[PDB]
């Protein structure tokens, strides 16, 4: 059996909400199927180059940036209006089917479940709300409030120092290969959810555990 | 007017296109290279972040094997190597030479900065044709730094020994503008396709089409 963490912090935009109405508003609008994996990558690359080059800006405000340079690459001249219309999907966001009865399973083991995002904290919460999953979490944690972004180390040790819970009796639980390396560097246990079109990452990257799902996660860990 | 020029490489003077067409046939889309570019891009400041420096290169073939999954491939590492070995024969941009040649009889000092590594940063100029016209060429492997980091551009300028008010990062990505701009450069953008300066208080102090006309617009 697997030892049992005290502590599960779940990655959101990518772990636990299906991004899909976001990409097609996205992919619509820009009309390309390749603009929302291409505007998504190019968002994360430039919140680390604004923590790198000594600046904290709010995530969704880099989303915007990286959304008017995205749609010029395809050829679009979206108004202001209509660019915040495409981006205010990522509001509307539905949970994944697996992760109400996942959370629930994890919830009734006693281990304690918060959220950890870059999106600011209004925001996060919206987004939660929507989907039927803030009511969950112990705690609801937006980087915004230390002004680090994930993957930087700072990021996962407030969610520990609030909590009061040392890494290595918690683990993230995230789809992205970059937020799985950030946890372990940062000491904690990791588990990665292999949503489709994410990887491991091969440098050193390889996780505790992996399954496909939250709810596989929770029967891993519970088994 | 600018003592010293610090030139991007890879998305300003060469040609990226062999490595992107290569890429592109390979996963079937014209898009994947683009996909690739930025994921490799964003690794690299992953490592940074979270403590490592790992060459550039390795990167890039760890990205590469992450993205041909999402366009239905699995190419073996033979495959991958060839591939990514059309980064060190990437022609000049056609205007280039004329620029640069324009900028070393004004006597502006002039280097190269890329976050390929050394041996290949070298093995490429070499190819393109460009190796002489520079007083010397960097790589982040020597400081262990990538850009946009500061002490990347830092590390030349006190190589170089000359101020950062009197130096110039001419650049075609957004992001080393901004980099070059918060280490206290004076900044040119390259407006190569595809490339888009960030809004964000990312505006350079000169935009030019190409690196020709950033030497016109500097000499005139």
Do not use: C
Not at 50 to 59: I, S
Not at 117 to 131: D, I, P, R, T
Not at 151 to 160: D, G, I, K, M, Q
């Amino acid at each position: 059996k697997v030892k049992k963490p005290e502590l599960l912090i779940f990655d959101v935009n990518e772990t636990l909400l299906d991004m899909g109405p976001l990409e097609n508003a996205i992919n619509e609008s820009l009309n390309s199927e390749h603009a929302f994996s291409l505007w998504f990558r190019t968002l994360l690359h430039y919140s680390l180059t604004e923590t790198l080059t000594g600046n904290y800006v709010d995530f969704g405000t880099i989303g915007k940036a990286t959304l008017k340079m995205t749609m010029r690459k395809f050829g679009k001249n979206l108004s202001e209006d209509r660019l915040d219309a495409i981006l205010g999907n990522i509001k509307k966001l539905p949970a994944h089917e697996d992760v109400k009865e996942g959370l629930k399973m994890l919830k009734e083991a006693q281990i304690k479940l918060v959220a950890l995002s870059n999106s600011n904290g209004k925001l996060l919460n919206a987004q939660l709300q929507f989907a039927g999953l803030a009511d969950y979490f112990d705690a609801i944690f937006s980087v915004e409030a230390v002004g680090r972004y994930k993957p930087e180390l700072a990021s996962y040790r407030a969610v520990l120092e609030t909590m009061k819970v040392p890494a290595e009796n918690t683990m993230m639980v995230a789809a992205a290969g970059w937020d799985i390396l950030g946890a372990k560097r940062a000491g904690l246990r990791t588990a990665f959810v292999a949503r489709e079109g994410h990887a491991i990452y091969p440098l050193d990257g390889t996780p505790e555990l992996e399954a496909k799902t939250v709810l596989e996660v929770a029967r891993t860990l519970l088994k």
